[PDB]
């Protein structure tokens, strides 16, 4: 069996890989940040509660001007909010109600939502006719779309339940690059700040590092036990945090190529649905199935705060580009905005 | 507020009104979930009531239904079965002909045991369709049902066999008191299908009318 010899070659190659990662693990992040001063208790309170959805809110995304946010719920609506005024500037009825993701364009021109329809439909907001209309339907994924993220007005990287990620061209509607290698189905995705690369996560309990310019996986990160629901880069673009069903958020370096640290408590047993950082990345927020967001000191592993406003599972949260406020959405059909 | 911010508040108020109207239209309709293994007669069911998730509208006795054939997508269902939390009923199509075909009936029991005891469906009633019963009416006598079911005491023709398959499906739920299972052996040319769906949704509608009325 020649493929058995190939599998032994693969086995000694992964053994050499974890030897190479183990050879550079001279210290932990925890003993480096043992000296640094803790930030204490972050007493965040709800500034605004956004109340217009009638079903479970599955996704949310902040605009780049830190005022408009889109939220997609299962009542067939994605609503774009004015977060300062709690005003709805756009209610968009969806083609399929079963939405699981939403995005906001960095230019602010488009939103893009997708779900069980296998289509990350793209909606033009700055139209001459004044209504929001579908601009492009992106079919081609054979599994449910879990996360789609905008690079530009013309490129969008989508994650789906067919174990592949795809980079699209919005004018053609044809996916230009396919990102294969995940064996389980990909649930989470986050772009780097320079957007030359991104990371994704699946039921392999693995995170993979894909480049949008060439199109292959350069790095694979392992250390979770189950599916990761959540991923978000550090604002430097050199690290990211992954939330899973293991009640463990884990941070990984790109350039050091291993897991650094685990954000776990004994009193948390439910899964993490969303993660995000702050502007500086000192603290990472994390939504839980225990209905509350947990603010973790991303350097000292301590629970710096608890945001317990929601009556159901916190499915989506995000932090503005200004870093002013954190919006958290949840399955009791409310967005709460914390500061 | 200035003039433009007051008009933005007014635009948001009309958007609130349309959201309330559309959620009130979708609150008074019935959302059903087709299931079952492959080629189990589900497509014949959705033909006789009338890429991604397939949706079917039909109004029966002034009651708007929305059927959801979600089975066209092949992914691990634990990551999207909570989207259908809060459906009224779960239409489950089991082929009686797939007892001898290949452990396909055992695959149907695997999927029924998975979703009948699912944590998001601890309350939702399940309509269970046993179709291809005429195909069962020939293939009872060509090959016995003991090749599918390991014990099967007392084999006969079509009556204790169908009742045994009924009883072997019905006890799979570990909580028989919170939820309730409906069953219908059905033909291909009959109006008992959508009639039974109406009369099994009506119990759930009564229970939801009492949940809305604090009871």
């Amino acid at each position: 069996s020649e493929l058995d010899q190939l599998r032994q070659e693969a086995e000694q190659l992964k053994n050499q890989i974890r030897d190479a990662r183990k050879a550079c693990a001279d210290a932990t992040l925890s003993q480096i940040t043992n000296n640094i001063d803790p930030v204490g208790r972050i007493q965040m309170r709800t500034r605004r509660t956004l109340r217009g959805h009638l079903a479970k809110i599955y996704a949310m995304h902040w605009g780049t001007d830190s005022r408009l946010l889109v939220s997609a719920s299962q009542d067939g609506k994605l609503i774009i909010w004015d977060s300062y005024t709690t005003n709805k500037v756009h209610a968009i009825p969806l083609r399929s109600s079963w939405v699981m993701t939403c995005a906001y364009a960095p230019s602010g021109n488009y939103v893009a939502c997708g779900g069980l329809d296998n289509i990350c439909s793209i909606y033009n907001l700055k139209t001459r006719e004044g209504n929001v209309r579908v601009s492009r339907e992106l079919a081609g994924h054979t599994g449910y779309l879990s996360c789609c993220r905008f690079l530009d007005d013309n490129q969008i990287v989508t994650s789906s339940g067919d174990t592949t990620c795809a980079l699209w061209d919005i004018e053609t509607g044809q996916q230009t690059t396919t990102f294969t290698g995940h064996t389980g189905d990909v649930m989470s995705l986050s772009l780097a700040p320079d957007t030359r690369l991104f990371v994704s996560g699946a039921c392999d309990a693995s995170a993979k590092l894909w480049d949008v310019r060439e199109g292959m996986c350069r790095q694979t990160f392992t250390g979770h036990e189950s599916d990761i629901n959540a991923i978000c880069f550090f604002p430097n673009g050199n690290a990211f945090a992954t939330g899973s069903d293991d009640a463990t958020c884990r941070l990984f370096d790109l350039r050091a190529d291993q897991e650094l640290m685990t954000y776990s408590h004994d009193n948390i047993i439910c899964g993490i649905t969303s993660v995000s950082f702050s502007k500086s990345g000192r603290l990472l927020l994390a939504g839980y199935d225990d209905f509350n967001c947990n603010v973790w000191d991303a350097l000292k592993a301590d629970r710096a705060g608890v945001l317990a406003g929601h009556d159901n599972r916190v499915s989506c949260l995000g932090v503005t580009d200004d870093g002013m406020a954190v919006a958290t959405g949840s399955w009791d059909s409310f967005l709460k905005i914390w500061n | 507020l200035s003039a433009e911010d007051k008009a933005a508040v007014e635009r948001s108020k009309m958007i609130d009104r349309n959201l309330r109207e559309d959620g009130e239209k979708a609150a008074r309709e019935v959302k059903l979930l087709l299931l079952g293994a492959g080629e189990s007669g589900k497509s014949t069911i959705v033909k006789q009531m009338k890429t991604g998730i397939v949706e079917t509208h039909f109004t029966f006795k002034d009651l708007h239904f929305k059927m959801f054939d979600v089975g066209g997508q092949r992914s691990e269902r634990k990551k999207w079965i909570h989207c259908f939390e809060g459906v009224t009923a779960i239409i489950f199509c089991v082929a009686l002909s797939d007892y001898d075909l290949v452990n396909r009936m055992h695959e149907s029991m695997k999927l029924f045991d998975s979703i009948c005891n699912n944590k998001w469906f601890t309350d939702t009633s399940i309509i269970l369709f046993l179709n291809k019963k005429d195909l069962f009416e020939e293939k009872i006598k060509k090959s016995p049902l003991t090749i599918c079911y390991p014990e099967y005491a007392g084999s006969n023709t079509y009556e204790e066999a169908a009742a045994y398959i009924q009883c072997q499906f019905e006890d799979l739920n570990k909580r028989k008191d919170t939820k309730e299972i409906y069953t219908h052996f059905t033909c291909a040319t009959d109006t008992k299908n959508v009639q039974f769906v109406f009369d099994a949704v009506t119990d759930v509608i009564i229970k939801n009318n009492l949940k809305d009325c604090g009871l």
Partner: single-chain antibody
Amino acid sequence: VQLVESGGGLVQPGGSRKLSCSASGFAFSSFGMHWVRQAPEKGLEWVAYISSGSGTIYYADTVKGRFTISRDDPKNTLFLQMTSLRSEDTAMYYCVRSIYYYGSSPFDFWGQGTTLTVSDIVMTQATSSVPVTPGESVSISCRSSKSLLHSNGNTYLYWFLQRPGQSPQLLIYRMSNLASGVPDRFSGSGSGTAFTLTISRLEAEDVGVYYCMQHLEYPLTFGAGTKLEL
């Protein structure tokens, strides 16, 4: 998009007249619509505004009680009902589309205008006519009589260009933001109650009368008009 209007002609004073503007190609139920007239030797003067959904109606003080604005959502038609008219209503009535959410561009589209013949933050244009060199940087200034910088961070000054024989178009909205369909050579800035419109690298077919409009509070008022003449 397109707006067409009708209802002009010779009307006796003291009588009644109904003008009608029908939408074509935009979601007319979602737009708050206005009426702005223009006397044949005088700049623009706002008349009425029925909101989207017909929930909110304002009028100018010179038309309050004599004019009635109402829309029709299925027929996609805005119509204005007048009575007891006089020679001060001898104008050309433009019907203006607008929309109001964050990031919107109100007053972006105007109807083509119909001549009608009958047999308060004041905005001040600093100079009614400036000389034009084609290719020269021209600054057009508007002087308010109130602080248009509202507390929310906005500054509701609007810039319009009425080309000769063509309807006013929105150039710059909220004193700073370019409208869709203007060159980047148009630029406006300023402070509270002090504004300017800088037109660097002036091109041909850009001459006309320029209008500054406040939108801090109703009634909306216009500038007298800054004519650009070669």
